[PDB]
Structures are given as C-alpha cells and as structure tokens.
Design a protein around this motif. Sequence first.
Motif, PDB file in Angstrom:
ATOM      1  N   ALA A 148      -4.595  -3.755  -5.306  1.00 36.24           N
ATOM      2  CA  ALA A 148      -3.414  -2.830  -4.689  1.00 36.24           C
ATOM      3  C   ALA A 148      -4.412  -0.909  -5.428  1.00 36.24           C
ATOM      4  O   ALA A 148      -4.528   0.107  -3.962  1.00 36.24           O
ATOM      5  CB  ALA A 148      -1.670  -2.419  -4.799  1.00 36.24           C
ATOM      6  N   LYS A 149      -4.704  -1.383  -6.580  1.00 41.21           N
ATOM      7  CA  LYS A 149      -5.684  -0.044  -6.856  1.00 41.21           C
ATOM      8  C   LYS A 149      -6.564  -0.350  -6.216  1.00 41.21           C
ATOM      9  O   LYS A 149      -7.220   1.206  -6.061  1.00 41.21           O
ATOM     10  CB  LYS A 149      -5.693  -0.332  -8.589  1.00 41.21           C
ATOM     11  CG  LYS A 149      -4.799  -0.183  -8.896  1.00 41.21           C
ATOM     12  CD  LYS A 149      -4.537  -0.845 -10.921  1.00 41.21           C
ATOM     13  CE  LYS A 149      -5.036  -0.041 -11.562  1.00 41.21           C
ATOM     14  NZ  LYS A 149      -4.156  -0.316 -12.306  1.00 41.21           N
ATOM     15  N   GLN A 150      -7.866  -0.797  -5.912  1.00 38.10           N
ATOM     16  CA  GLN A 150      -8.662  -0.878  -5.101  1.00 38.10           C
ATOM     17  C   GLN A 150      -8.681  -1.005  -3.319  1.00 38.10           C
ATOM     18  O   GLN A 150      -9.471  -1.322  -2.505  1.00 38.10           O
ATOM     19  CB  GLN A 150      -9.859  -2.171  -5.149  1.00 38.10           C
ATOM     20  CG  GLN A 150     -10.585  -1.943  -6.454  1.00 38.10           C
ATOM     21  CD  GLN A 150     -12.298  -1.588  -6.493  1.00 38.10           C
ATOM     22  OE1 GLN A 150     -12.405  -0.601  -6.137  1.00 38.10           O
ATOM     23  NE2 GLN A 150     -13.011  -2.540  -6.190  1.00 38.10           N
ATOM     24  N   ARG A 151      -7.148  -0.865  -2.984  1.00 37.11           N
ATOM     25  CA  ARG A 151      -7.564  -1.156  -1.406  1.00 37.11           C
ATOM     26  C   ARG A 151      -7.287   0.206  -0.725  1.00 37.11           C
ATOM     27  O   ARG A 151      -7.212   0.975  -1.073  1.00 37.11           O
ATOM     28  CB  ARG A 151      -6.121  -1.871  -1.232  1.00 37.11           C
ATOM     29  CG  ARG A 151      -5.587  -2.446   0.447  1.00 37.11           C
ATOM     30  CD  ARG A 151      -4.234  -3.073   0.425  1.00 37.11           C
ATOM     31  NE  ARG A 151      -4.240  -3.851  -1.233  1.00 37.11           N
ATOM     32  CZ  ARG A 151      -2.649  -4.454  -1.577  1.00 37.11           C
ATOM     33  NH1 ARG A 151      -1.464  -3.435  -0.661  1.00 37.11           N
ATOM     34  NH2 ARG A 151      -3.025  -4.580  -2.387  1.00 37.11           N
ATOM     35  N   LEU A 152      -8.081  -0.132   0.544  1.00 34.53           N
ATOM     36  CA  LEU A 152      -8.226   1.106   1.382  1.00 34.53           C
ATOM     37  C   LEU A 152      -7.073   1.793   1.396  1.00 34.53           C
ATOM     38  O   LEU A 152      -5.964   0.850   2.335  1.00 34.53           O
ATOM     39  CB  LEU A 152      -9.402   0.727   2.799  1.00 34.53           C
ATOM     40  CG  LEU A 152      -9.100   2.169   3.015  1.00 34.53           C
ATOM     41  CD1 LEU A 152     -10.353   2.644   3.060  1.00 34.53           C
ATOM     42  CD2 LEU A 152      -9.910   0.843   4.515  1.00 34.53           C
ATOM     43  N   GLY A 153      -7.460   3.189   0.958  1.00 31.37           N
ATOM     44  CA  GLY A 153      -6.197   4.181   1.032  1.00 31.37           C
ATOM     45  C   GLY A 153      -4.778   4.022   0.680  1.00 31.37           C
ATOM     46  O   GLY A 153      -3.820   4.920   0.890  1.00 31.37           O
TER      47      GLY A 153
ATOM     48  N   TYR B 289      -0.614  -0.231   3.610  1.00 30.19           N
ATOM     49  CA  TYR B 289      -1.825  -0.638   4.329  1.00 30.19           C
ATOM     50  C   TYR B 289      -2.047  -2.292   4.076  1.00 30.19           C
ATOM     51  O   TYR B 289      -2.700  -2.666   4.981  1.00 30.19           O
ATOM     52  CB  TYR B 289      -2.872   0.338   2.827  1.00 30.19           C
ATOM     53  CG  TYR B 289      -2.815   1.076   3.652  1.00 30.19           C
ATOM     54  CD1 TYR B 289      -3.550   2.242   4.330  1.00 30.19           C
ATOM     55  CD2 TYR B 289      -1.831   2.175   2.450  1.00 30.19           C
ATOM     56  CE1 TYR B 289      -3.108   3.312   4.906  1.00 30.19           C
ATOM     57  CE2 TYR B 289      -1.562   4.003   2.295  1.00 30.19           C
ATOM     58  CZ  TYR B 289      -2.402   4.117   3.976  1.00 30.19           C
ATOM     59  OH  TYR B 289      -1.986   5.634   4.105  1.00 30.19           O
ATOM     60  N   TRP B 290      -1.650  -2.989   2.912  1.00 27.15           N
ATOM     61  CA  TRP B 290      -1.950  -4.750   3.321  1.00 27.15           C
ATOM     62  C   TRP B 290      -1.268  -4.924   5.271  1.00 27.15           C
ATOM     63  O   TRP B 290      -1.962  -5.740   5.522  1.00 27.15           O
ATOM     64  CB  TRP B 290      -0.773  -5.058   2.159  1.00 27.15           C
ATOM     65  CG  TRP B 290      -0.592  -6.457   2.067  1.00 27.15           C
ATOM     66  CD1 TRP B 290      -0.399  -7.076   2.664  1.00 27.15           C
ATOM     67  CD2 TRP B 290      -1.960  -7.514   1.060  1.00 27.15           C
ATOM     68  NE1 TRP B 290      -0.356  -8.719   2.685  1.00 27.15           N
ATOM     69  CE2 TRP B 290      -1.691  -8.599   2.179  1.00 27.15           C
ATOM     70  CE3 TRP B 290      -3.446  -7.481   0.863  1.00 27.15           C
ATOM     71  CZ2 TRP B 290      -2.155 -10.208   1.172  1.00 27.15           C
ATOM     72  CZ3 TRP B 290      -4.386  -8.444   0.585  1.00 27.15           C
ATOM     73  CH2 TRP B 290      -2.860 -10.012   1.200  1.00 27.15           C
ATOM     74  N   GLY B 291      -0.360  -4.651   4.768  1.00 24.23           N
ATOM     75  CA  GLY B 291       0.887  -5.007   6.247  1.00 24.23           C
ATOM     76  C   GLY B 291      -0.214  -4.877   7.704  1.00 24.23           C
ATOM     77  O   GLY B 291      -0.736  -5.660   7.770  1.00 24.23           O
ATOM     78  N   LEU B 292      -0.773  -3.380   7.335  1.00 22.26           N
ATOM     79  CA  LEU B 292      -2.001  -2.762   8.905  1.00 22.26           C
ATOM     80  C   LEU B 292      -2.872  -3.569   8.179  1.00 22.26           C
ATOM     81  O   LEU B 292      -3.180  -4.720   9.874  1.00 22.26           O
ATOM     82  CB  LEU B 292      -2.304  -1.534   8.172  1.00 22.26           C
ATOM     83  CG  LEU B 292      -3.466  -0.901   8.721  1.00 22.26           C
ATOM     84  CD1 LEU B 292      -2.697  -0.480  10.003  1.00 22.26           C
ATOM     85  CD2 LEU B 292      -4.092   0.333   8.944  1.00 22.26           C
ATOM     86  N   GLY B 293      -3.611  -3.979   7.435  1.00 20.48           N
ATOM     87  CA  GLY B 293      -4.479  -5.297   7.517  1.00 20.48           C
ATOM     88  C   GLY B 293      -4.557  -6.706   8.260  1.00 20.48           C
ATOM     89  O   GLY B 293      -4.493  -7.275   9.458  1.00 20.48           O
ATOM     90  N   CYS B 294      -3.185  -6.913   7.851  1.00 19.07           N
ATOM     91  CA  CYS B 294      -2.201  -8.170   8.683  1.00 19.07           C
ATOM     92  C   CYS B 294      -2.287  -8.316   9.944  1.00 19.07           C
ATOM     93  O   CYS B 294      -2.425  -9.516  10.461  1.00 19.07           O
ATOM     94  CB  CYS B 294      -1.074  -8.894   7.293  1.00 19.07           C
ATOM     95  SG  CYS B 294      -1.203  -9.260   6.037  1.00 19.07           S
ATOM     96  N   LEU B 295      -1.870  -6.781   9.864  1.00 19.50           N
ATOM     97  CA  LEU B 295      -1.420  -6.590  11.637  1.00 19.50           C
ATOM     98  C   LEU B 295      -2.829  -7.033  12.547  1.00 19.50           C
ATOM     99  O   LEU B 295      -2.674  -7.350  13.191  1.00 19.50           O
ATOM    100  CB  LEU B 295      -0.902  -5.562  12.115  1.00 19.50           C
ATOM    101  CG  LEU B 295       0.779  -5.295  12.874  1.00 19.50           C
ATOM    102  CD1 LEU B 295       1.727  -6.626  11.578  1.00 19.50           C
ATOM    103  CD2 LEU B 295       1.374  -4.247  12.745  1.00 19.50           C
ATOM    104  N   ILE B 296      -3.848  -5.975  12.190  1.00 16.79           N
ATOM    105  CA  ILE B 296      -5.169  -5.309  12.557  1.00 16.79           C
ATOM    106  C   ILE B 296      -5.799  -7.190  12.775  1.00 16.79           C
ATOM    107  O   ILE B 296      -6.261  -7.915  13.957  1.00 16.79           O
ATOM    108  CB  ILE B 296      -5.860  -5.294  11.826  1.00 16.79           C
ATOM    109  CG1 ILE B 296      -6.039  -3.643  12.022  1.00 16.79           C
ATOM    110  CG2 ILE B 296      -7.391  -5.250  12.782  1.00 16.79           C
ATOM    111  CD1 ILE B 296      -6.718  -2.669  11.056  1.00 16.79           C
ATOM    112  N   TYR B 297      -5.990  -8.255  11.302  1.00 15.91           N
ATOM    113  CA  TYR B 297      -6.242  -9.500  11.697  1.00 15.91           C
ATOM    114  C   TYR B 297      -5.500 -10.718  13.013  1.00 15.91           C
ATOM    115  O   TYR B 297      -6.398 -10.297  13.757  1.00 15.91           O
ATOM    116  CB  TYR B 297      -6.465  -9.838  10.386  1.00 15.91           C
ATOM    117  CG  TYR B 297      -6.916 -11.585  10.524  1.00 15.91           C
ATOM    118  CD1 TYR B 297      -5.987 -12.595  10.964  1.00 15.91           C
ATOM    119  CD2 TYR B 297      -7.956 -11.699   9.594  1.00 15.91           C
ATOM    120  CE1 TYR B 297      -6.280 -13.877  10.888  1.00 15.91           C
ATOM    121  CE2 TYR B 297      -8.056 -12.955   9.116  1.00 15.91           C
ATOM    122  CZ  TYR B 297      -7.735 -14.215  10.119  1.00 15.91           C
ATOM    123  OH  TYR B 297      -8.617 -15.591  10.040  1.00 15.91           O
TER     124      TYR B 297
END
Length: 501
Positions: free
Chosen positions: A404-409, A344-352
């Motif tokens: 990571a505990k508060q990250r979406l998904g 999900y972190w990756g996903l963020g990095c990509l959308i950005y």
Amino acid sequence: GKSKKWKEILKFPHISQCEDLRRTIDRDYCSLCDKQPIGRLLFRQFCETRPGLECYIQFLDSVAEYEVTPDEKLGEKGKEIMTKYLTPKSPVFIAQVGQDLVSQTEEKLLQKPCKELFSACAQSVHEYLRGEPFHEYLDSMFFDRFLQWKWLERQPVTKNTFRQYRVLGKGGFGEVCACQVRATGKMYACKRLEKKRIKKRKGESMALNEKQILEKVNSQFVVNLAYAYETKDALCLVLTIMNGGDLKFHIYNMGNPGFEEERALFYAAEILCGLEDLHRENTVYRNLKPENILLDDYGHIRISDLGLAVKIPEGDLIRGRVGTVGYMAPEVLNNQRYGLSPDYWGLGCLIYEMIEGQSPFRGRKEKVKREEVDRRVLETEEVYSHKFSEEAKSICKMLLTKDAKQRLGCQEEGAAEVKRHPFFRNMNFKRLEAGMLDPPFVPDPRAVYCDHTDDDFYSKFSTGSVSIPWQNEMIETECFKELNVFGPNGTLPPDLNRNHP
Ligand SMILES: Cc1[nH]c(/C=C2\C(=O)Nc3ccc(C(=O)N[C@H](C)c4ccc(F)cc4)cc32)c(C)c1NC(=O)CCl
C-alpha cells in the motif's frame, strides 16, 4: 407527474415567517451564492438587475465555457473572451479586474493557451462580488426569496411526502423501492431499513454512519442522499435512482465478456472521480466491485452501497477485515491499519476486470476456494494479455501493488497522481466532470437490465431533506422556474411585502 395542488404544497411562506432563519443562516458568500443551487441562481438574478454587475456574471459563464473547450479551440475562445470583456471600450467591460491583470492575461494568450488562463481574473471577480455586491444582495428581495426557499427546504418530510412504487432491489437489512415526490414528481430510490432487524443486530451506528457519509458526499459519481425520514416499521434513505443496470451485468452478460479498453477508460475515469470525491471527506469505500457500480439513464455511472464506508479521522488509520472475497486489498486481508489505499486497489481490480473479462486472481472459468484466491492476492502477480495497451498494463500494475505504501494514488498527492497517469492521457477530466463526454453505452429507456434509546437514535437519523439535493430537485422539476415569480416590472410580490401579509 406533479400532485394536483403542488403549488399549494410548495407555496412560499410570508417573509415574516423566516425571521428566525434570517438570523441563523451563516452569511457565507461561497455557500449562499455558489454551493447552494437556488442561492446561486438567486444571486445571479440579483446581479441581473444591475447594469454594473451583469457583465461579471456573463464573464464567469464564459470562463466556465473556456475551461471545458477543446484544446484546438482554446486560442479562439480565449481571444473572444479577451476582446469582449477585457478591452477598455466594451459594453461589457469589467473594471474591478486590475488593468495590470488584463495586461498580464494578454501575455498568456500570446503564448501557449492553458485551460486556466482566466483563473486569475475569475478569482479577482469573485473577490469583487464577495464584497459590496453580496452585501447588497443580502438586503435585497432575492435573499428574502432565498429565505422562503430555505423555509420550504426545512419542512418536515413524511411518508405522505412520497409515493412508493415497486420493489426494484433487495438486500440484507431491508429492500430498495422506487419512490416519487408527489409535489415535484422526481423519481428516487428508497432504501427501506427494517427497524426490527436494526434493533436486533444492533446496527444503529452502521446505518447512521452510512446516512451521514451519504449526506455529506456531494458528487456526480456517487449516489447522493436526498432525504432521510422515519416511518412505522422502517426507516428510509431516499437516494439517486439508477435504472441503467450495474457494471457486472454489462461486463459479463453484455460484454465479450469485457469491454474495449476505451470504454473501460470512460468508466474508470468516472469511478476515479467518485473516489476522489469520497477522499475529500477522508472517507474510504472498501466495497469496490463491479456490481456496486451502477449506470443511470444517460449511461453515466455512480458508486453505490456505501454501507461499508468509514469516515477516517485525519491523521489516524483504521482496521477492519471487510469486503467481498476477491476484492480485498492485501492490507485488508492481513487485517492491518490502513487508510484509503484499499480503494485504489479496488480501482485496479476493476480496470483489469473491465478489460480482460475476468478478475485478476480468479478465472471466469475457474473453480477455486476462498483461501487460494487470497493467497494469490497476497503472493501472486497478475498477468496481462494483448487486450491491454502498455499504458493499461502500467496503471493496473501500479494500482495492484501489494505494498500500500508504493501503490498509485496512496501518496500525499492522492487521486491526482492517478489522473496524470499515461493510461488517462486521452481523457479530459474537466469535460468529464462537466458531463460533456458522451458515455459509450446508453441504456434504452424501456429496458430492464436485471423503548427510549431507539427514540434518540431515530432523532439523529431522520434529519429530513438534504440541502443541495433538495434544491437541485426543485430546479430539475421546474418547480423553481414556476414559483420564483415577483411583481410586474421589478416590484415586490405580496408574499415578500411585510405591509399586507
Ligand atoms: C431500479 C434499481 N434500483 C437500484 C439500486 C440502487 C439504485 O438505483 N441506487 C442505489 C443506491 C444505493 C444502493 C445500496 O446501497 N444497496 C445496498 C447494497 C442495499 C443494502 C440493504 C438493502 F436491504 C438493499 C440494498 C442501491 C441502489 C438499481 C441498481 C436499479 N437498477 C436495476 O435494477 C436494473 Cl433493472
């Protein structure tokens, strides 16, 4: 472009050769009549010989159509289905759905319509077919024909099974070529792994793990494994060919750099569906960067390079500081026990990166050392421009949460939590998963957008054709349509009659 004598290569074996298959295949309804493409088609064909069963297949087709129907057109398509399949006087009336449930479905139509109005009735129908009709199908010529297709499916695959063409990719342990199946003519991408470097680096378990993850994923938004075979001086992985280039190229060489928010939304939705499919098998990707998102001929994307993926044991966490500089989540850099959250972190990095035309922690026009990039990822909060709608800012912030505990998904709800996010408010995921939304960029066809221990290891790697991809190949190339022939006027063809082999 099928071989001269392809009909002789895929010639059905006489039913008498499949006895060992008959008593080995698990007689599971969902597997034999839904998951397996050729089994699903043959079961539907069986139901197409019985006036009684035909209507149920037609109904389920119409329900599939209703699910993807536009919102404004739901109430219409609903009524149609109703007044056609569920009125007592219909030539296509279905009775095994309780009259009770008919009078309960009318209700939900009398109120706002949802995309799941007929889910109850469809489940009822499946329950009916899972019983007597399925068991009749089992003692039917269509299931014998399915056994013949399975027999072909299990045949040994070799180098001669394929026709390698041009080296269209390279990498570490080998290269990526383009290979065709001589019998069917379907194009694929060979991933050639040089046995020598694998023995040396002792990467047996890594190559094997990649093969197993690829064969156990069955997604439209990840590269699928079709065949895994061995040769002399290499092993091979036959995967989905992707000729539309990669997302890095389209962001930077074809972009502003960057995309319009809506285009990035399309790609982000498809990548999220890919990640969801990977998380169903509790597998974590950890390599989400724009050059690993590939485009196909139609403009759709798939996740590629699973060489860094890991099947996580349920209830257990893993540890591993792996990935690409700038696309490693905080918990990965800190080398902590993590789960699927990196993705999900990756996903963020990509959308950005899709929207802004640069990574959130390194400028395109900036020159920094790995250590400063990592410090930014762990301590610095990213900044957003006017290219982001408030919803896009929101989703990127929540996916780029350092904890990571508060990250979406990353809750027990999983990717669903992300699909509900306001950023995707205008995205119909049912229609996207059905391939019905037009991609925002369609590549031009002509374009070009760029010992004994070892023996045992090979045995577990070179497992041959993969079932669902093999059957789908058979259908797409029309091999199935051409060979799946019977006797004139619904009678037994020679290859299915045990009397005169
Ligand atoms: C023709 C073509 N093949 C590909 C490539 C693929 C593809 O299509 N599916 C794929 C599924 C998986 C992988 C994959 O895991 N690679 C890893 C990093 C790897 C590992 C070791 C090695 F030695 C070489 C590669 C690659 C591909 C692409 C994009 C185009 N497209 C263009 O080149 C635009 Cl002209």
